């Protein structure tokens, strides 16, 4: 069963790398949203 | 296999931190989107 | 070790429920984004 | 524990499907955000 647990650890870390990237992309969306809102506010 | 099991548990704790971040950022984004839509729509 | 694997299955399903909710929320963001873009396009 | 291990593998496959969706939707959102920002900015 150690062969299977080995595959699980590897896949979890691969999927986490993907979620990590997603997290970075979401930060950009927030910053872009704030910029868009400012273009719509008098200043 | 206890060593492998420990690795799995720590990856899950790491993943939880990431989901928490995605969840809170998602809220910030949607609230921003609604505000932006309102700035463009007849009130 | 069955006690630990039991906790892993439960936690994975709990975290997936969270990702499932996130997925639904993201669909809304896309639909909201399309509506915002249309308010900015002549028609 | 092989039965529990199988449950874990299937949850991971389910999670992957979800991450794939989040990843593709995120792209659609950012491209929309950039287009919206452009519609509001001097070109
Ligand atoms: Sr988003």
What CATH number did the domain enclosing B3 receive?
1.20.5.430
In D, minimum Cα distance to A29 occurs at: D30
All chains having 3 or more CB pairs closer than 8 angstroms to chain D: A, C
C11 within 8 A of B12, measured Cβ to Cβ: yes
Write the CA distances from A12 to A9, A42, B41, C7, D33, integer angstroms: 5, 47, 44, 16, 31
Tell me the three-class secondary structure of D1-43, residue by residue: CHHHHHHHHHHHHHHHHHHHHHHHHHHHHHHHHHHHHHHHCCC
Range of the domain at B27: 1-43
What's the gap in Å between A27 CA and the centre of ligand 1? Answer: 9
Q: How was this structure determined?
A: X-ray
Residue of B nearest to A1 (CA): B1
From the CB of residue B8, how many other CB atoms can be counted at a distance below 10 Å?
19
Burial of C25 (0-12, 13-18, 19+ CB in 10 A): middle
Resolution in A: 1.9
Tell me if residue A43 falls in helix, strand or coil: coil
Number of domains in chain C: 1
Give the CA-trace dihedral at B32, B37, B38, B42, to 10 degrees.
Answer: 180
Q: Mark out the alpha helices in A1-43 (DSSP H runs).
A: 2-38
Distance CA A24, CA A17 (A): 11
Neighbour-count burial of C16, counting CB atoms closer than 10 A to its CB (0-12 exposed, 13-18 middle, 19+ buried): middle
Chain C residue numbers with beta carbons less than 8 Å from the beta carbon of B19 are 15, 18-19, 22
What lies within 8 Å, CB to CB, of C13 at 6+ separation is D11
Name C26's Cβ contacts closer than 8 Å, sequence gap at least 6. B26, D21, D22, D25, D26, D29
Q: For residues A10 and B42, what is the distance between their CA atoms, to the nearest angstrom? A: 52
Nearest to C18 by CA among D6, B26, B29, A28: B26
Considering only the beta carbons, identify the residue of B5, B33, B40 that sits closest to C33.
Answer: B33
């Amino acid at each position: 069963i150690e062969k299977q647990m080995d595959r699980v650890v590897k896949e979890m870390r691969r999927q986490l790398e993907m979620i990590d990237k997603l997290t970075t992309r979401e930060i950009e969306q927030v910053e872009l949203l704030k910029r868009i809102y400012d273009k719509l506010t008098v200043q």
